[PDB]
Amino acid sequence: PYTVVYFPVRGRCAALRMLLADQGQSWKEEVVTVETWQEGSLKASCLYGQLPKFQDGDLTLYQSNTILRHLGRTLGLYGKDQQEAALVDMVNDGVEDLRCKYISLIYTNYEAGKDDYVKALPGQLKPFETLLSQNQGGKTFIVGDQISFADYNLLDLLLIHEVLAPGCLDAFPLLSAYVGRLSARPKLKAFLASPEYVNLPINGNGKQ
Amino acid sequence: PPYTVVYFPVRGRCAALRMLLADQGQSWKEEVVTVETWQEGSLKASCLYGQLPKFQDGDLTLYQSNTILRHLGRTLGLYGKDQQEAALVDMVNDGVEDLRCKYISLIYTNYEAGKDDYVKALPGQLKPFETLLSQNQGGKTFIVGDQISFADYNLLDLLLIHEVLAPGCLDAFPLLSAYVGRLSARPKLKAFLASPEYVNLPINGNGKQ
């Protein structure tokens, strides 16, 4: 069915795992240890030399956001029509931009750059608060009336930022309630409480 | 429509979508934002992520360069023939964006001290696109499938700006080299790429390239 090939971290696979779990899908995790990675054969076979790698039947994919968009397209989590699909992309690309900055903080400048990052964070979260504000009072999903792949990515994004800077959502009522509502979904709640999520580090260097 | 492109007077993250629009017979308005106007702050505060490009398609306002490309990709028939092709198109675009991200960081934050090592690492960054071409009809067509996609325009722009940064960087990659020559020769795109329009804008906003 579906196969996720990645290191034993949440990282760039947390959102697509949340998606698969919440949509009732089954998948196989193939965990790559770092000692297997430094051997070099798997990395050499990876299109961009990186993980994650994903299998959907006989279709092999790389890029975390390609995986999300593919699941969105094939499972119907991409909006109701081309205009909503564009808005879904606009949210996901915004999520990706902040994740990229988060990853840079974690791996290359945590100690010295955290203060600084945290101070900039409210300005980085407000666009998502604004998007919720413009969609049914923030009472449903980031775009439209149904969940999309961007909701799962946004949710992961918010969760890891709550760990980095607890209380960071206190200034954003719609985002705070949105985290609460999505996290309470029955399948996602079960997954987020499970050892396969809880006992993985967010990032590869233990920093969070 | 015409569409509207709101951007600084730079090629930057609008080069690919403009090439797409020009090659696909579309009409659009360029609303150029000067430094003076941007720094006044009204427009910026009105942008969803505080940044440009902003794109108008009728009543639909979009931000994010890659959202604009995907929107034009799906509405103009440049996203592959089926769901499989669409996923491969995304995989290419995401790889383009990753390397564009590294290019922009070099240009704006570390150009003088970092350009040397960036060009040294560049063959490793181009090889995946050569590999993708080798697996699609011997590199003789497009990056995905046998019709042009929005990822072709983004990859072409990425390759072109890298040829400015490091001339001859594609000489070691015969399929990418032929691909660039082939796409650049598509007559409407060729006319656009030789136009004032394109030629008279700097690649980046800080004068480095």
Ligand SMILES: N[C@@H](CCC(=O)N[C@@H](CS)C(=O)NCC(=O)O)C(=O)O
């Ligand atoms: N843009 C890619 C980035 C993938 C990426 O950064 N992978 C890292 C782990 S999160 C990796 O494989 N590092 C090992 C290496 O580059 O050698 C995506 O979203 O999947």
Ligand SMILES: N[C@@H](CCC(=O)N[C@@H](CS)C(=O)NCC(=O)O)C(=O)O
């Ligand atoms: N991820 C965004 C990045 C947009 C971006 O970086 N915009 C820059 C120009 S390329 C900008 O607006 N700088 C002005 C500012 O941030 O105030 C996209 O792809 O559109």
